Swiss-Prot record, chain A:
The gene is rpl8. The keyword Ribonucleoprotein applies. This is Large ribosomal subunit protein eL8. It is found in: Cytoplasm. Belongs to the eukaryotic ribosomal protein eL8 family. One of its GO terms (biological process) is maturation of LSU-rRNA. Transmembrane segments: none annotated. One of its GO terms (molecular function) is structural constituent of ribosome. GO terms for cellular component: cytosolic large ribosomal subunit; preribosome. Component of the large ribosomal subunit (LSU). Mature yeast ribosomes consist of a small (40S) and a large (60S) subunit. The 40S small subunit contains 1 molecule of ribosomal RNA (18S rRNA) and at least 33 different proteins. The large 60S subunit contains 3 rRNA molecules (25S, 5.8S and 5S rRNA) and at least 46 different proteins. The keyword Translocase does not apply. Component of the ribosome, a large ribonucleoprotein complex responsible for the synthesis of proteins in the cell. The small ribosomal subunit (SSU) binds messenger RNAs (mRNAs) and translates the encoded message by selecting cognate aminoacyl-transfer RNA (tRNA) molecules. The large subunit (LSU) contains the ribosomal catalytic site termed the peptidyl transferase center (PTC), which catalyzes the formation of peptide bonds, thereby polymerizing the amino acids delivered by tRNAs into a polypeptide chain.
Curated annotation (Swiss-Prot), chain B:
The gene is rpl3402. One of its GO terms (molecular function) is structural constituent of ribosome. Component of the ribosome, a large ribonucleoprotein complex responsible for the synthesis of proteins in the cell. The small ribosomal subunit (SSU) binds messenger RNAs (mRNAs) and translates the encoded message by selecting cognate aminoacyl-transfer RNA (tRNA) molecules. The large subunit (LSU) contains the ribosomal catalytic site termed the peptidyl transferase center (PTC), which catalyzes the formation of peptide bonds, thereby polymerizing the amino acids delivered by tRNAs into a polypeptide chain. There are 2 genes for eL34 in S.pombe. It comes from Schizosaccharomyces pombe (strain 972 / ATCC 24843) (Fission yeast). Component of the large ribosomal subunit (LSU). Mature yeast ribosomes consist of a small (40S) and a large (60S) subunit. The 40S small subunit contains 1 molecule of ribosomal RNA (18S rRNA) and at least 33 different proteins. The large 60S subunit contains 3 rRNA molecules (25S, 5.8S and 5S rRNA) and at least 46 different proteins. It is found in: Cytoplasm; Nucleus, Nucleolus. Belongs to the eukaryotic ribosomal protein eL34 family. GO terms for cellular component: cytosol; cytosolic large ribosomal subunit; nucleolus; preribosome. It comes from the Eukaryota. Its main location: cytoplasm. Keywords: Cytoplasm, Nucleus, Phosphoprotein, Ribonucleoprotein, Ribosomal protein. The modification Phosphotyrosine is found at Y20.
From Swiss-Prot, chain C:
This protein binds to a specific region on the 26S rRNA. Component of the ribosome, a large ribonucleoprotein complex responsible for the synthesis of proteins in the cell. The small ribosomal subunit (SSU) binds messenger RNAs (mRNAs) and translates the encoded message by selecting cognate aminoacyl-transfer RNA (tRNA) molecules. The large subunit (LSU) contains the ribosomal catalytic site termed the peptidyl transferase center (PTC), which catalyzes the formation of peptide bonds, thereby polymerizing the amino acids delivered by tRNAs into a polypeptide chain. The lineage of its organism: Eukaryota, Fungi, Dikarya, Ascomycota, Taphrinomycotina. This is Large ribosomal subunit protein uL23A. It is found in: Cytoplasm. The chain holds residues 24 to 141 of 141 of the full protein. The keyword RNA-binding applies. Belongs to the universal ribosomal protein uL23 family. GO terms for molecular function: rRNA binding; structural constituent of ribosome. There are 2 genes for uL23 in S.pombe. It comes from the Eukaryota.
UniProtKB/Swiss-Prot annotation, chain D:
There are 3 genes for uL2 in S.pombe. SUPFAM superfamilies: Nucleic acid-binding proteins, Translation proteins SH3-like domain. One of its GO terms (molecular function) is structural constituent of ribosome. This is Large ribosomal subunit protein uL2C. Component of the large ribosomal subunit (LSU). Mature yeast ribosomes consist of a small (40S) and a large (60S) subunit. The 40S small subunit contains 1 molecule of ribosomal RNA (18S rRNA) and at least 33 different proteins. The large 60S subunit contains 3 rRNA molecules (25S, 5.8S and 5S rRNA) and at least 46 different proteins. It holds the Pfam family Ribosomal_L2_C. It comes from the Eukaryota. Keywords: Cytoplasm, Nucleus, Ribonucleoprotein, Ribosomal protein, RNA-binding, rRNA-binding. It is found in: Cytoplasm; Nucleus. PANTHER family: LARGE RIBOSOMAL SUBUNIT PROTEIN UL2 (PTHR13691:SF16), RIBOSOMAL PROTEIN L2 (PTHR13691). Belongs to the universal ribosomal protein uL2 family. InterPro entries: NA-bd_OB-fold (IPR012340), Rib_uL2_dom2 (IPR014722), Ribosomal_uL2 (IPR002171), Ribosomal_uL2_C (IPR022669), Ribosomal_uL2_CS (IPR022671), Ribosomal_uL2_dom3 (IPR014726), Ribosomal_uL2_RNA-bd_dom (IPR022666), Translation_prot_SH3-like_sf (IPR008991). Gene3D superfamilies: 2.30.30.30, Nucleic acid-binding proteins, Ribosomal protein L2, domain 3.
Amino acid sequence: NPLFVSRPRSFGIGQDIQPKRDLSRFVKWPEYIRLQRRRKILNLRLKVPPAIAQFQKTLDKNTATQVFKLLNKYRPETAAEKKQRLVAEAEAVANGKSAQDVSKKPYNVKYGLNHVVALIEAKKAKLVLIASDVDPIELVVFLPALCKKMGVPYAIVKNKARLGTVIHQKTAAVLAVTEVREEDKNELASIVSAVDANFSAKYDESRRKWGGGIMGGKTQALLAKRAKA
Amino acid sequence: LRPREFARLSHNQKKVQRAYGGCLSANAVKDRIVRAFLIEEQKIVKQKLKQ
Amino acid sequence: KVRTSTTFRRPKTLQLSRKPKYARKSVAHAPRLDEYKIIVNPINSESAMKKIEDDNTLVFHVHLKANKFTIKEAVRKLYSVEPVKINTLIRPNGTKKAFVKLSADADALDVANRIGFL
Amino acid sequence: GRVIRAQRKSGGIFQAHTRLRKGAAQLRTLDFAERHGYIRGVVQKIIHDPGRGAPLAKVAFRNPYHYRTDVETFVATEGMYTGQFVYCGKNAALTVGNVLPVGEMPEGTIISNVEEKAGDRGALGRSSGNYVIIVGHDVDTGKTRVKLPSGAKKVVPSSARGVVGIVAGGGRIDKPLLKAGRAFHKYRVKRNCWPRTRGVAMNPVDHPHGGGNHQHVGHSTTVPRQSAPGQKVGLIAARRTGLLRGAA
RNA sequence: GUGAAGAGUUUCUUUACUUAAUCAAUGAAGCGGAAUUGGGAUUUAUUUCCCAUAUUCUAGCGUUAAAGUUUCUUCGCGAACUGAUCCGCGUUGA
RNA sequence: GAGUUCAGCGCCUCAUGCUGAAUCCGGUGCGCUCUCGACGGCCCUUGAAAAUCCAACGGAAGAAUGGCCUUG
RNA sequence: GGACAUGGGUUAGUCGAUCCUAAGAGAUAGGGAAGCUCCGUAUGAAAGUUGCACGAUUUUUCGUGCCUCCUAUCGAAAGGGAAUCCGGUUAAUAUUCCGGAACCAGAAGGUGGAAUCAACACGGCAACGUAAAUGAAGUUGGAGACGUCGGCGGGAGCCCUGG
C-alpha cells in the first residue's frame, strides 16, 4: 500500500515527452482522401447555380421512409420468381388459357433513366423519385424542370444505392411510380401532396436561389469576433 | 583493438565495473552524479519556496 | 479511428498465394547435372599420376558449372569412396579439373585401377 | 563566336565542393514549443566548416514528441562556448545565442541568422562578422523593419526568428591573403572560380573584350540590364562609375 | 471567381474574401472556437466593454505510465474512463 | 625433430640410405629502412562516407523446495 | 630463341574479387517531350521491416492485436574490411600442394563452478581487477575515421665490431 506512489507527468512545453494523443487533424492523408474532402469543401463554398443548388435539400426523414415503405411493395421481381413465372406460363400454355387467367398485370415501380424520362414526357408517371448523388449531375439536372413542365410530381431523395436496393441493382438514378393498386390510392395521394408541398410548390423560388458561398471555420470565427466589436 | 576484435573479448575486458563503465570516464561519471543530485535538490527547494 | 501518427501507411491485406488452373510446364525437367553429368573422365597425365601415387588424390576432369559440394557427391555415388578435401582448378583451355584427396582407409591407386584408366 | 566562361558556369565543373562540409546551418523547424514558449538546447560542438568563414555550432535538443535527441547546426555567434545552454522560442531570454521571434525583440537590437519569412530557418546576416539591426516594429498587420549588412531596409513578418548577437569569425577580410597560394587554398574548398583571366587578354571568339592590337575593351564596359547572355559582361546596369568622394 | 466604396439603362479606379492559381516548411506534431480560473470596471456590479500560460540549468536523466472513482469477481503489470477538457469545412504560414 | 655448415660409412646401389658433430658467448651507434610513443609549428587550407563491431542508460521477461535427488 | 611442332602446367574458409560507401551512375513515383527519350532518387507515393505474446495440446517463431524518421540498386583487384605461419616439394604451382603448428565466421548444443530453502558473484579508501558473474525494446556513446612539416625517444630488420 505505501509503495503505490503517484508519479504524475506535467506534459508542459519542454518538461516531458508528449502523450500519444489523436493526430487525425494533422495527418497527411493520401491523394484520394484529400481530393474527396477538398471536393466536398469546394462544393460547399463556390456558390452553386440554382439548377444544381436545387439538390442538397431532399425529403425529410418521415416522408422518405413513407415513400420507401410504399415503394418496397412494388418491387420489380427477381430472377428466381421470374423463372417460376416462366415455368408456370409454360405449364399453363399446354391446356389452360392464355395470360388472361394465369398471370395478372404486373404492378412494380419503374426504373431506368431513359424509360423514366419517356414516362414523364408521356404523362404516365404518377410519382418520380430522383437520386440526389448522381455523380454526372447532367443526367438528372433537367428532371425537376421536365417534371414541373409536364405536371408530374417529383421528389429528390438521398442514397441512389437505396433507390437501387428496391430495384435489386447497385445504383438507380431515378425511379418512377406509374400504376398501383386501388386500396393504396389514398396513401399515394397523401405522399404526392406532401411531395408537392416541398418541391413542386417551391420550384419557382428554387429557380431564383443560389447555393453554396459559405466560408466556414476560421473565417467565420474571425468575422464573428470582428463583428462583436 | 580493431572494431571487429572486440567481439571475441569477454564482457569484463571491454568495460569497467562502475555505472557507465566502458562508456564514460570516472571523472565524467562523478561529475554527472554530483550535477544530477545538486540540480534535483535545486528543483526541490524551488518547489518548496514556491509553496 | 484514433491515429497517433501524422503519416498514413497502407494497411496490410490478405496477400493470398498462387493457385494456378494449369501447370505452365507439362513435364518437370529431369535433374540437370547428375553424377554422370558431374564427372567427365579421369586425368592420366604425369602430374596426375604423381598425385595419385604420392598423395592419394585423384585428378578428374569435371564440368565448368560443378562445385566441390556436387563433386564430392558424384565421386561417392560413382566410385563409393569418401573424399576428405577437394580443390578446384580451371585450366587455360576452359575446362575444370578437380583434385580429390581420399581418406587413409581408401587407396587412390586401387580406385584408379578399378576405374580402369591406369 | 564561342560560349564565354560566364555562360559556362552553369554547373558541372563549377559546382560547389561540399564533401567536407558538416551540414546546412538552418536554425530549426518552427514548432509548437518555439511558437508558444521556449525550448532549451545544449551546445556540444563548435566546428570549422570548410568554405565558410564562420564557425558552426552543433547543438543538441530534446525531441518534444519522441524519446530522441536532435542535433542542430546553428551558426555560432561570437562568445558562444561549448556546454552552454541556448533557448529558442517566444519566451526565450534576450541573451546572446538565444533564438527569439523578431517581433518580440526591442528596437535597435543586434541579431544574426534572421529569417526573411516565418519558417525560413535563417536567411539574413549569416556571414562571419555580419549582423542585422532591428530598426522598428509595426503592430498593425505585424511587420518589423530591419537593417541589413548591405545597409538596405527590409520589412519582415513579426514572427521570423533570429539569433541574438554577432556571427563569430570576427573581421576575416582585414588580413591580406599575401599569396596566390593562400587564395588558391581559400577557393579550393569553395568552387572552381579562381584564378580569373581578364577578357581583354582573350581573343574575340572567347570574350567580348578580346582582340585588338592593344589590350582594350573598345566599347563601354557599362552594359544594359536586359543584355543577352554572352554580352552581359563588364559593369552590368551601372548606375554610376569611377571614384566617388563623399556621398550617402 | 465573389463583394464594398468614389463616377461622368450602363463599368473606370482602389479595397476586401479565398477555393482558382503561386511560394515556403514539415514525421503535413498541437490551427480556430467554447465552460469554469484570479486579477480586471461597467458599479447599492452581470465575464457587459478587457486575456490571461507550466521547462533558465550547473555540459546529469527524462521512452515501453504511475495515481484515481469502478467493473468482471479483486487467478491479473485484466477490459474501458480519466490522467491527456470538449468541438470542427482548413496540415501550417506568406 | 626444422634449416645451415662440416666430416665418414653402404658404392650398381636401390624407396637414396645410415652413422657423427657445431649451430655458442658479447658489444656498439646524431648510422640506413620500417614502425611506435610523447611533442611542437602552419592554415581566410582544419585535412571522406558507409558497411560492420563494441560499450553504456533503462528495465521487458523469468519461477523449485519434503534443510534434501530434481530445473531457468 | 619470346620462332615452328607435339604434349604438360595455374590446386585458397585465412591472398584478392565478392561486402560497404565516395565522386558519380541509375532505375521507381511524378512531371515534360510528337517521339527517340529528358528531369527527377521520401521527390507532392496508401513507397514497411524491426520490436511484444492475444490464441495453442505444452515448454514453442504462426494467424491475428496497435504500432514507429527503415529502405531500389550499381559504383575502388591502391579507400574501409573476420581470420595463417614455418619448412619442404615440381621441368613448370605455392601464404593455395605436402608435413607440422594455428586462426576466423556461422549452425546446433554435452559438461562444469558460481548464486537461489528465494533471487541474477566478489575484491580495492580510488584509479580499477577476475575463469564465468541473467538481461527485450527504445535511446546514447565509441571504434571504423583520417592533413602536412620539424626535432626527440624506443623497438624490429640491416650495417659495424670482440672472442
